[model samples]
Target: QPFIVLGQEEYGEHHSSIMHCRVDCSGRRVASLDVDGVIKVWSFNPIMQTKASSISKSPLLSLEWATKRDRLLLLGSGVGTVRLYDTEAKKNLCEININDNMPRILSLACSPNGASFVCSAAAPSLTSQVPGRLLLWDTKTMKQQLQFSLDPEPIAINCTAFNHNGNLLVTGAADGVIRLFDMQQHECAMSWRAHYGEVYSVEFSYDENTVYSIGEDGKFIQWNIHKSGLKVSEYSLPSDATGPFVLSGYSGYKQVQVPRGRLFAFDSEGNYMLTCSATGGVIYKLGEKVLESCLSLGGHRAPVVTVDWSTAMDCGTCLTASMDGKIKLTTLLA
Candidate 1:
């Protein structure tokens, strides 16, 4: 079977970069955040073709969808600001500044009720003076509720996901750690050093009892939060590949090639795993004993940074974004 191409577009100038992408609740719309502080919305079809809807004036470092109201939330990293764009109104609804002098707002997550959300920042900051601090905000009141700091400054707050019940928040950090927090108690419940290197992405299983995380270590680990253990029975990526431990050998050249932690997405049914890498992409069937390599998409001159499986359609279609400034829609064949 061959990989199908969907669509591609550039978000910033050629020298600039685009890093993160997230699809909306309906899965028909995509919001992308680039290094230039630009946030662009795209309307996508089942085949993966996309058209730009609007570009925000502020450069957005992260993009997330408010599942409750289906609103697109764009986070401005440089300024520590949050903006919401109403897709239907085609208007910028509100821009809220959580921290005036904080570091980059690298990640954000909306609560299940959509009444509020959470945001986290990245490393080496004067205001935050630490790596990870969680900011809780009430969307309706347009106010911040609380801030919780994660020890050992996070290199990057790769992704934040709310469990199925919305009572817990699972965060993947650059420290290669996965931390779980209880929303009600506003406290950290559990912490696991999941990967050897920085963890860049994570997805909670549909049942919320387990979570899958991919990291710069170039490995994916499944954690059973209920029992505070890892699913050792599950297959892990090869040890020789990139990961927290594997990357340590190259510490001398850390500035030149910062590991791009690239895996994303749990299938809607949570039975399969979709991951993108600096080399290529792979889709692993859950509970299966083998790594089923997917198509080799090489059009991107640089590494593919993000990939998202479309939940709006049942055709097994996925979207991918690369540092080379192209987005491709890939369809899987049985």
Candidate 2:
């Protein structure tokens, strides 16, 4: 194994499971959130040092760093709110509600220039048929810029990403479909069923020629978005991949089921990608004609819920957040 466990950071022995983790564009800081709505910021200059931390009243579903504004952090919460927090200033810049009904905000993605951001939110329902709303916001004003509702046959959108030029937006939904949106046209450019199960995350390849998606089907798919006809390739995740354990509640009943996988991160150069497995983080080498499993970051006793790459992959250092309630700093052999 090429992966090495550099070190680890834990909230406490009784803390909740970490649901999301993100390394800022500068690779100097990391922000991680737990199911209990606790958020912590770690400085990576020397080691895992606590820089700043805060608690959100509502559980956070997604987190991202502002592309141009390096110190700004964007987070979406279960209460249908998108908030902008300044890690440098240590205060919230602003916030906006996605809807009056307080739907759960599933994902957030900032444009490459950090001029704007998009958020996906859906109201809680017993059925998956419920529609989801995708809203775009002006970063400077924190005002709504655009709204996209999937309408008649809408499904919960789980993740969203912006291409390098910020001209294209890609979204992954519960319907196992991936839709590409032309940001300038404000319409869906193309869509296809990319997986057999719900898609957890989607990203544009470093070169912006292909799109990669990870899903509940225990598969990672690569699609050529430039091809006139459809082109796709699939690779298996870990053999023990059992997805994530989901718990839901109805009137008087509580339902528990293992649903799907979590998010993935592309290294700064896009030469490799890191995704969650059953209890570890797997690194896959990206190539023009092949995807190879090169290393595994193992140490988590439970499922690695999310992973994010720092700017310096030459050092092979990245952060892995796990359901075991710990966020680990891992490095692969350089």
Tell me, by TM-score, which candidate is best. 2
Q: After superposition, how far is residue 107 of candidate 1 from its true place, in Å?
A: 0.5
Model 2 root mean square deviation, Cα atoms: 4.1
List model 1 lDDT by residue over 1-334, tens digit each. 4334443433332233456667778766777655555555666563333344445455456667887786555454556677777766667778877653555677788888787788886545443134556788888887888887676553456678887768899887767678888999998888888876667777788877788776666666778878664664445675323322111134463212232323566567877666655544456666646666544544454455566776554555565565555555555533
Model 1 lowest lDDT segment of ten: 240-249
Clashes of 2: 0
Instruction: Rate residue 132 of model 1 by lDDT.
Output: 58
For model 1, the stretches where C-alpha displacement exceeds 4 angstroms are 1-16, 46-59, 123-130, 151-156, 233-262, 278-280, 288-290, 294-301, 332-334
Q: Give the residue spans of candidate 2 off by over 4 A.
A: 1-14, 149-152, 239-242, 245-262, 287-291
Per-residue alpha-carbon lDDT of candidate 2 for residues 1-334, written as tens digits (9 for 90 to 100): 4345555444332176677777787777778887778888777656557778888877677788899988889988878788889998899988877755637888888898878888888878566556777888888888998887563366788889888889999998878888888999888888888877678888988878889887778777789898622656777776444355433346674333233224678776788888766557778887534458787777777666667777564565667666657776775554
Cα distance off (Å), candidate 1, residue 318? 0.4
lDDT score, candidate 2: 0.74
How far residue 193's Cα lies from its native spot in candidate 1, in Å, is 1.9
In TM-score terms, candidate 1 sits at 0.79
